[PDB]
RNA sequence: AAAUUGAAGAGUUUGAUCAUGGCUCAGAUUGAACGCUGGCGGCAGGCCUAACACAUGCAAGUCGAACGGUAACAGGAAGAAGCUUGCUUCUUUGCUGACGAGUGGCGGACGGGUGAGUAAUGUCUGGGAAACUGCCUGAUGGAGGGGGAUAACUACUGGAAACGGUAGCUAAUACCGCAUAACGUCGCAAGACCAAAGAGGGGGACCUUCGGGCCUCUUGCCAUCGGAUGUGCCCAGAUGGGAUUAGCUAGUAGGUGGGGUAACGGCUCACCUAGGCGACGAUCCCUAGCUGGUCUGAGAGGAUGACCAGCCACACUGGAACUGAGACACGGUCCAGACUCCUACGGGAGGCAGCAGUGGGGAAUAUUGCACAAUGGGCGCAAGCCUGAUGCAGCCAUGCCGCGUGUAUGAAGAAGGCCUUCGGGUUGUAAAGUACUUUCAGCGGGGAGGAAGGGAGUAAAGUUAAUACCUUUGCUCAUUGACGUUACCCGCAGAAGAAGCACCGGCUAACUCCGUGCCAGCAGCCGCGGUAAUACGGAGGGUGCAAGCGUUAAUCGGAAUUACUGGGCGUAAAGCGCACGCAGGCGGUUUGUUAAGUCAGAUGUGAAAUCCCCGGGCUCAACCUGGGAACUGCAUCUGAUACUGG
């Protein structure tokens, strides 16, 4: 970049990018564990997995990695499905 | 506060949808003759109670599909 | 945010300001929300020169609109005049 | 290429003077044009030297175009006559390539590069 | 921006005295008043309808010392204004400062009065106005400023003035060299061999 | 009170006529150019072409009151000395006024440029419902206790440069756990789950580890529900042309369910139904940013979309996402392309449609200027710093408006020129002479306003333990203008420095002589030129404009010559060679009904500017400005039911 701060911003945005990426990848992992339990038909594994997932979709919302509404749908959606089976 | 349209059913083929035509007379902007104009609207018909040729009362609502932003309120006249 | 300030109209060497409420990001002579006074710095002062709808200014402040250094002065000046 | 330069206080006062020098240089230009054509005192050449070659020259530097042209008129002979047309201050241009389009001529430069609009004309017509 | 050439030529072409000289002299002893200028002055113009309209407009312009652009703008304003356009044109002309200065007798001619104006010898309401076309209003007081008061042109100008018909709508004090534009002149105040409607016709076609 | 209360025709077909019909002219207008000419000023305008390519400077920073900090300069200091004993220079130490580089915060999504793309994820009008929203704002509570890092820096090392490699090492409002957790999110509920950060100013007992504790106020941080502003989304109507384009469509149209977004949605995927669009113009092709408005017209229209303002789109070309409240980013990142620059040859760097400026193209469009003083934006508690936004200045008669280039007197009316029947006429009161004025330009002298604030003190209130600090409001003192030699006023010198352009046969205001002789030439249209040419060219005279005047280009007008208002088709251009007939248009007469068309009223909206009316301010005018009227339109509701439609 040409301007002093523009240079600095590219550096900061890359750091943030690697920070966000790391936390975001983690989060989707814990979401995916729940969908995987559901697809195997286990209430407990899927409830257990939902309980681990809950606090982290909530936290990443508070931290701006995602919006509150996204966290809610995930909880709403998974909760809907797990109940529909056991 | 119930804004509404009235028109007749030109197609009832789709599952839970209908095509409604709203026809009106309009003064021609230049030559003054009163001309027929038609507005076709894709409308929601849960329960498919609307038959082709029916005259129906419809209202505007949120998007229901790529092309549906209207739903059925009630049938007015049917099976001419 | 929303701010109350002077949009400079008039002609070269003969400034004339229109007091306006607007989104602070819009250009000075660009999009505004409401016009609320004017200010002639070149008025003969034999008659008028500064007119403010103080009722609507306050209404906008009540909803968090900020106020220019120059409008903040006009308001204290006009409040003093009467 | 060279001359006496003098600064002035205001540009407006120096505008009329500069335009005045152009008028004299233009008046003598048309003057020398009328003489050379009328000098023959006949509608054509008395003999068969009428066949000639035309050239088009634009040099990056102003000093050369006046200087080398004098040397370019030294190689001139009675049999074949060569003449320069539209000596340029630099580079190349649309009206210059057009100048070589009307009358067949070689387009040469002491130092020049082809403009983006210049390449299109030169590549299209045969030059 | 001003007509600077011979003046009696203009009178001679229009067929009338245009008051472009002081009036000290019978105009016929200064020029062949009843003959147009030039080799073919004796010739008569079998004059078209357009011709009579043109010459009438020229006449008025030449009386007041106004060139085409400003005079056309005067027509436009007369037209825009309420009431008869032809009469409005003459109100506007007759309200000019160079004109008013002439009518109060401060200048022997409108040309002389105009010079008085331009040369900062005239005040309006004790305020210096130096542009000829300044529109003068009811109750205004135009005066020769103190320093210009001893100019002999002005005394002579007031003498001649005293020998012309005296305008109704102006109150002039010759001693003070001040005067008051009481009101806009009516149509009836102004000469009756001016044909404004011809000028109005020329500018509507 | 006023505020669309306005409308012209002429030449040219014929021997002549009337009609038909085209061509042409008078008018307004312009971002103009060219030719001749050119004094001043005010206000405006200024690449219409190549969304061609760009050297150089500048156009986005700021905060030490978040943080470790010193390298510059500035003081200060135990202690070195300049020592001529209070003046001091350097060795030192961030002690502090500050501050390079660094982490961190907020801004680089605004301001500014362009109109390529787009006939619709556009614009205009009018409505909807499923949403987010930094800074500013109201409400109610948090702001507990910890942890591991890292740039800077240090050491070693690679590069020509750009910029790196190792290992050390350290701070925070950087970053992460843990606790706390509802008027928040999920859930029928029971329950389950989510955050944070400090930094400053001043200080009374009181005292220590002299850091501060503690007291106090300012400010920032977290949560939730609001306000305001911004933005996303959906529907309807309108918004160019072409049928020498008639059929178009597989995420296509809908349904179910999963996923997805801030949010509704074929947004996406699977499955199912077989739909959806189209002659009321789809599809395809050409062209184009839309609007307020602008020009023209009596109007209805026609033409148009510089300058000002609103929306959109773009940022070398094609594609992409990252950061962020906001971007798929105008001076950010990545990939590919086109192109250019640097190189020590191995490798690097960049994107003016920001402001100047350059090359190129063109009939044609400006200075590589001054200033943040004013308004406004970014950061900061502030002081302030930044701001080619902006305010100004330069250039160009490009346009509009104003003024000047003198005023008065001056006759047998000179000389010269021009015409003349040689009598005289004219140029012409024109000139000379005579007085007289001095705007503007020149030169000296003086001198408003655009300035509000901010800075020291002071005093009072609200604060508080407090007279501190903070903040508000009065007081005094000293101060802040790029423009600038400002506007304007006074003085000096002398008419002194300031007039050109086109036209004069009819249309069309203005006539004669000489030269030429169907030549040279003119020409908007008719038409001039072979011996008297008011038509060519010169002259004298005259007409029209005037710092301009002509020519060319260009829109509308006149043109009722695309005719809705407002025309025609026997012989003038125009009835299909004839009939049947789908779609379409139109449809006799009565009643009832309906209330879409139509009509009425009410309400909201129709941005500001512009236009118009009455006022106000610059000496006037252009120009600036207050208020009004107007926006003839759209939409919702409620009525009326004669006519049209059902």
Swiss-Prot record, chain A:
SUPFAM superfamilies: Ribosomal protein S20. Residues 1-25 are annotated as: Disordered. GO terms for molecular function: ornithine decarboxylase inhibitor activity; small ribosomal subunit rRNA binding; structural constituent of ribosome. The keyword Ribosomal protein applies. Pfam families: Ribosomal_S20p. GO terms for biological process: cytoplasmic translation; ribosomal small subunit assembly. Belongs to the bacterial ribosomal protein bS20 family. This is Small ribosomal subunit protein bS20. It comes from Escherichia coli (strain K12).
UniProtKB/Swiss-Prot annotation, chain B:
GO terms for molecular function: rRNA binding; small ribosomal subunit rRNA binding; structural constituent of ribosome; zinc ion binding. PROSITE patterns: RIBOSOMAL_S17. InterPro entries: NA-bd_OB-fold, Ribosomal_uS17, Ribosomal_uS17_bact/chlr, Ribosomal_uS17_CS. The keyword Signal does not apply. Keywords: Antibiotic resistance, Ribonucleoprotein, Ribosomal protein, RNA-binding, rRNA-binding. One of its GO terms (cellular component) is cytoplasm. Transmembrane segments: none annotated. Gene3D superfamilies: Nucleic acid-binding proteins. One of the primary rRNA binding proteins, it binds specifically to the 5'-end of 16S ribosomal RNA. Also plays a role in translational accuracy; neamine-resistant ribosomes show reduced neamine-induced misreading in vitro. Belongs to the universal ribosomal protein uS17 family. Part of the 30S ribosomal subunit. NCBIfam families: PRK05610.1, uS17_bact. This is Small ribosomal subunit protein uS17. It comes from Escherichia coli (strain K12). The gene is rpsQ.
UniProtKB/Swiss-Prot annotation, chain D:
It comes from the Bacteria. Induction: Part of the metY operon that extends to pnp. A proteolyzed form, called IF2 gamma (begins with residue 290), can be detected during purification which has all the activities expected for this protein, although it is slightly less efficient than full-length protein. It is not clear if it exists in vivo. It is found in: Cytoplasm. Disruption phenotype: Essential, it cannot be deleted. The C-terminal region (residues 165-890) is sufficient for growth at 42 degrees Celsius, although it grows more slowly at 37 degrees and is cold-sensitive at 30 degrees Celsius. When overexpressed partially suppresses the slow growth and decreased 70S ribosome phenotype of an rsgA knockout; RsgA may be involved in 30S ribosomal subunit biogenesis. Belongs to the TRAFAC class translation factor GTPase superfamily. Classic translation factor GTPase family. IF-2 subfamily. Component of the 30S ribosomal translation pre-initiation complex which assembles on the 30S ribosome in the order IF-2 and IF-3, IF-1 and N-formylmethionyl-tRNA(fMet); mRNA recruitment can occur at any time during PIC assembly. This is Translation initiation factor IF-2. It comes from Escherichia coli (strain K12). The chain holds residues 637 to 763 of 890 of the full protein.
From Swiss-Prot, chain E:
GO terms for biological process: cytoplasmic translation; DNA-templated transcription termination; maintenance of translational fidelity; negative regulation of translational initiation; response to antibiotic; ribosomal small subunit assembly; ribosomal small subunit biogenesis; transcription antitermination. InterPro entries: Ribosomal_uS4, Ribosomal_uS4_bac-type, Ribosomal_uS4_CS, Ribosomal_uS4_N, S4_RNA-bd, S4_RNA-bd_sf. The keyword RNA-binding applies. Pfam families: Ribosomal_S4 (PF00163), S4 (PF01479). GO terms for molecular function: mRNA 5'-UTR binding; mRNA regulatory element binding translation repressor activity; rRNA binding; structural constituent of ribosome. One of two assembly initiator proteins for the 30S subunit, it binds directly to 16S rRNA where it nucleates assembly of the body of the 30S subunit. Belongs to the universal ribosomal protein uS4 family. This is Small ribosomal subunit protein uS4. It comes from Escherichia coli (strain K12).
